[PDB]
Design a protein around this nucleic acid. Structure first.
Ligand SMILES: [Cl-]
Ligand SMILES: [Cl-]
Ligand SMILES: [Mg+2]
Ligand SMILES: [Mg+2]
Ligand SMILES: [Mg+2]
Ligand SMILES: [Mg+2]
Ligand SMILES: [Mg+2]
Ligand SMILES: [Mg+2]
Ligand SMILES: [Mg+2]
Ligand SMILES: [Mg+2]
Ligand code: NA
Ligand code: NA
Ligand code: NA
Ligand code: NA
Ligand code: NA
Ligand code: NA
Lengths: 140, 154, 186, 95, 156
RNA sequence: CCUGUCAAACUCCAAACUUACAGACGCCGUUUGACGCGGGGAUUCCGGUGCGCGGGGUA
RNA sequence: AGUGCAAGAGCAAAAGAUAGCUUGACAGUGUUCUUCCCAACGAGGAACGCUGACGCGAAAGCGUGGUCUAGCGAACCAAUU
RNA sequence: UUAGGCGGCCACAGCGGUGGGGUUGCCUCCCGUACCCAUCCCGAACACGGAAGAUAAGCCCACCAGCGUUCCGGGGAGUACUGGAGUGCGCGAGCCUCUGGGAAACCCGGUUCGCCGCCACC
């Protein structure tokens, strides 16, 4: 049963929601790979009327690239609980979000006969705190 | 097999109705025809229901009428037993009548005009403004009801 | 689901199995479809026609019934695909089928992909199919050379037990060679 | 009518019931008919092309050859004979 | 103006406010009267039933309703009863106030279409039918002839 | 939850009925030639009423 | 939601969004429906072909301008190819 | 069909939920990036190569009706409406009789947790 039910880290998105950049540089070094531009939608008063327009960057880290990052990111965070997703996710911080899920997730991401993950096989906030907490730190 | 008798004139009556009476071989007030009880024939008489008088006649009545008002497809010739015999598959009027009612043959198939041009009802009919259930003379009738009319117009 | 006014996708769309917009462009030709499908371990190739109550398969070939002819290698690779294509192609020919269009279903038209391999094979089997030569692999990769060389970077057998150690694109030739004359079910 | 465009008064006939909403199945858009075959004309709200003048929705014509993939269906408008260019998507076999 | 001009239900249903504008406000003050805090938990229930389909202008509704409830103070301002007028004036009515040229009238008011046999008014009382009298007065101000029907009340 | 009402430019529903085509019966046509085709000559393009359904209008 | 604009209608692995590429908003000539139900009537419009030349795509295929119904103009004369 | 591929009809098939199933025909998740190919950044996806592990997802199998849907019984209802007829009624609005058709809401009880086609396959 287990093994194919025990949590795992799938991507850690580190993004800097600026308002117009030179910031990419630090994300590249802080993560280890190129950042991605962040265009925005809708015209607004914060002199942000431009639809297509660089307004920040992000970086999606997977596998070791993600751990090797969290192995310093997490340490710089304290928070826990309430600050957790209903799906077992959590964002802290410059932002650093962590998407957590179980083994058969490719089922909801693939092209062919894709399917959404059943609620039972979904990850709960609790089941999440356990997995991470059980990896160099403390909850709440 | 029902006996159809037109009791209301053509003036003002819908054309699609009038044409039906015409397809059923009736072209004058007081003319009668004998129609089989089929789905097709049912629909037609229902559509004509308000300007006609119909029902199933008794053997005798049909006979009286046939004798009194039947005609060759052409000519004056009186249709009596001898005529019936020397001209039809049957041996006499009753033989013919029975066949009609049992819907085995038709006035045409026997070289007879599909129309029994009856006489006005002696003593008059019950009116052409109300149906039978209302004391009138329009619509479906009792075998006793039809016979009375048919006989009075013999 | 929600109400009377709710609209439920057709079944094969709920299942994410059939792309109906493409299916229509496919049926347009009026020709039989060369259905190229895959699996983690296998590769299927069917020749489908249209029918009163659903499609009709007039000829097929599955990477598994490949061994039935001497295949002693894995069945989810390029050489496998090609051959399965050639196998179905031939059976197809036997069935009186002469032309068909390539239905790669929900797969991507990536160059040198296995579906195109399935297509190259089917064509070589004698089946007439609208294609584009330079979207296909360069014969060698079809043979399975990309894998042989990959095992050159050995240190540990690419194949767990299986057959050989340095693998054999030759085994590929021997098989293609075989399918090109006589034998049962062809 | 306040206007005389083709779609005048076609709000009902050229609209789908909510559940038949969305792309139509390709099976009937590819059906093959033969000259002499009787077919019912009914535009499919979801199929933009291959249509005919709405006035003819409900007619039962007789296929008589085709033009390109579209068929040429003979019908009689009132008392006038007419040839309608229509695709299978908007046709159905009689009986 | 007279009821004569609007009492018949011969014109089309005219109620789409998305296409009609300048519609006068209803004069009907309220629809729930008496102890509306309480629910119909009364022994007796009399209703006023219209006997012919008619159009009743918000004018008459208010005048009929007032006349009845205003009288139901034979029971006192905060007496124990609840009175309901279940109909609402949805039908917009016009007047062509040029002779017959461009005669589509202009909105002048509203009315309620009541079908013969519907009950326009419903009262709820304890064996104390002064309400029967409140209605001899209410159907006095509406076009139709009416029926004063008693429902839960075998206390005769 | 409970409770009070509506729609010519609303519709989860939904007739009667009208309508395309075909079969069947009826009726009609093959000396009274129907259906249809071609040609000659018009008149006519102020209409009205009853009933059913209407839209406008206090009427 | 969006799809340039009335209203009604169409559309979700798209008819919408993003990206990239492209100029089929191409020349020639027709069939058919519409304009004008039935039922004659021009310009205009549309649907659907063919010939030629092209664009994109692995390909089936799609492109006869914009998802559909408005956005239009005779003879004579002039200019233009 | 001891798990497959392509479909037809396109909710009777949807939504939600319970139980069962894999040394193998198998499907998957899964393992992994030298290659074909790939991410405006990530072998996540796509593509390619492969079996150490698993039946927890998916999927296939058996089942539940709470919701949505389909059809049926009984009631609503031969009610509403309506094609044809009337020297029937009514000041009128309108109604009634005869004849031929005939609903919707809602309630109660069943049904429905897909059916079927081709191909392949201990
Ligand atoms: Cl596949
Ligand atoms: Cl047309
Ligand atoms: Mg004679
Ligand atoms: Mg006398
Ligand atoms: Mg009399
Ligand atoms: Mg309408
Ligand atoms: Mg009509
Ligand atoms: Mg277009
Ligand atoms: Mg001039
Ligand atoms: Mg399980
Ligand atoms: Na559709
Ligand atoms: Na004036
Ligand atoms: Na009164
Ligand atoms: Na024209
Ligand atoms: Na950019
Ligand atoms: Na499983």
């Amino acid at each position: 049963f287990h093994e194919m039910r025990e949590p795992r880290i799938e991507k850690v998105v580190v993004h800097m929601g600026i308002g117009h950049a030179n910031a990419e540089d630090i994300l590249g070094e802080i993560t280890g790979q190129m950042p991605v531009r962040t265009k925005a939608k809708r015209t607004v008063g914060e002199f942000d009327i431009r639809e297509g327009d660089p307004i920040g960057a992000k970086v999606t880290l997977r596998d070791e690239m993600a751990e090797e990052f969290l192995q310093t990111a997490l340490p710089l965070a304290e928070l826990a609980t309430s600050q957790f997703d209903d799906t077992g996710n959590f964002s802290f911080g410059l932002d650093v979000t962590v998407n957590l899920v179980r083994p058969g997730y490719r089922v909801a991401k693939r092209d062919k006969a894709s399917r959404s993950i059943p609620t039972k096989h979904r990850l709960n906030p609790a089941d999440a705190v356990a997995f991470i907490e059980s990896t160099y730190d403390v909850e709440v | 097999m029902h006996a159809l008798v037109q009791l209301r004139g053509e003036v003002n009556m819908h054309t699609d109705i009038q044409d039906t009476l015409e397809m059923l071989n009736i072209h004058h007030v007081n003319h009668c025809t004998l129609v089989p009880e089929t789905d097709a024939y049912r629909g037609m008489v229902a559509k004509v229901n308000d300007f006609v008088a119909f029902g199933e006649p008794s053997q005798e009545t049909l006979e009286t009428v046939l004798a009194t008002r039947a005609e060759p497809l052409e000519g004056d010739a009186d249709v009596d037993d001898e005529w019936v015999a020397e001209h039809t598959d049957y041996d006499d009027i009753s033989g013919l009548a029975f066949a009609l009612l049992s819907e085995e043959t038709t006035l045409r198939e026997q070289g007879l005009s599909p129309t029994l041009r009856l006489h006005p009802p002696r003593g008059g009919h019950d009116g052409v403004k109300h149906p039978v259930k209302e004391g009138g003379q329009l619509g479906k009738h009792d075998t006793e009801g039809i016979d009375d009319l048919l006989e009075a117009m013999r | 689901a929600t109400g009377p006014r709710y609209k439920v996708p057709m079944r094969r769309r709920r299942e994410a199995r059939t792309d109906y917009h493409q299916r229509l462009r496919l049926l347009k030709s009026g020709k039989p479809r060369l259905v190229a499908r895959k699996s983690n371990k296998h590769v299927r190739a069917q020749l489908v026609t249209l029918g009163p109550n659903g499609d009709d398969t007039l000829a097929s070939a599955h990477s598994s019934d490949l061994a039935e002819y001497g295949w002693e290698a894995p069945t989810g690779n390029m050489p496998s695909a090609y051959l399965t294509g050639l196998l179905a192609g031939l059976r197809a020919q036997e069935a009186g089928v002469e032309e068909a269009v390539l239905d790669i279903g929900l797969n991507s038209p990536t160059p040198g992909s296995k579906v195109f391999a399935i297509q190259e094979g089917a064509i070589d089997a004698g089946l007439d199919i609208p294609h584009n030569d330079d979207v296909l692999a360069d014969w060698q990769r079809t043979r399975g050379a990309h894998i042989a060389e990959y095992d050159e970077q050995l240190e540990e057998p690419l194949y767990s037990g299986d057959f050989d150690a340095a693998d054999l694109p030759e085994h590929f030739d021997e098989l293609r060679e075989t399918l090109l004359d006589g034998d049962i079910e062809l | 009518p306040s206007s005389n465009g083709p779609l005048e008064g076609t709000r009902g006939k050229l609209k789908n019931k909510p559940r038949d909403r969305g792309t139509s199945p390709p099976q009937r858009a590819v059906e093959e008919f033969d000259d002499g075959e009787k077919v019912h004309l009914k535009i499919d709200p979801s199929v933009p092309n291959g249509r005919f003048h709405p006035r003819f929705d409900g007619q039962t014509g007789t296929v008589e050859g085709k033009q390109g993939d579209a068929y040429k269906v003979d019908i009689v408008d009132g008392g006038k004979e007419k040839t309608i260019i229509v695709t299978a998507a908007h046709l159905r076999r009689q009986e | 103006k007279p009821g004569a001009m609007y009492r018949n239900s011969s014109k089309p249903a005219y109620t789409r406010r998305e296409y009609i504008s300048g519609i006068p406000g209803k004069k009907i003050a309220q629809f729930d009267m008496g102890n509306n805090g309480a629910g119909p938990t009364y022994p007796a229930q009399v209703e006023l039933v219209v006997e012919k389909p008619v159009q009743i202008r918000h004018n008459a509704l208010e005048a009929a309703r007032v006349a009845a409830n205003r009288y139901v103070q034979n029971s006192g301002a905060a007496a124990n009863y609840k009175f309901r007028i279940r109909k609402f004036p949805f039908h917009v009515i016009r007047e062509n106030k040029d002779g017959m040229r461009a005669p589509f009238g202009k909105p002048v008011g509203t009315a309620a279409r009541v079908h013969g046999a519907n009950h326009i008014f419903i009262a709820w009382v304890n064996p104390d039918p002064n309400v029967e009298e409140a209605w001899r007065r209410a159907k006095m101000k509406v076009t139709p002839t009416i029926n004063i029907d008693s429902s839960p009340a075998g206390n005769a």
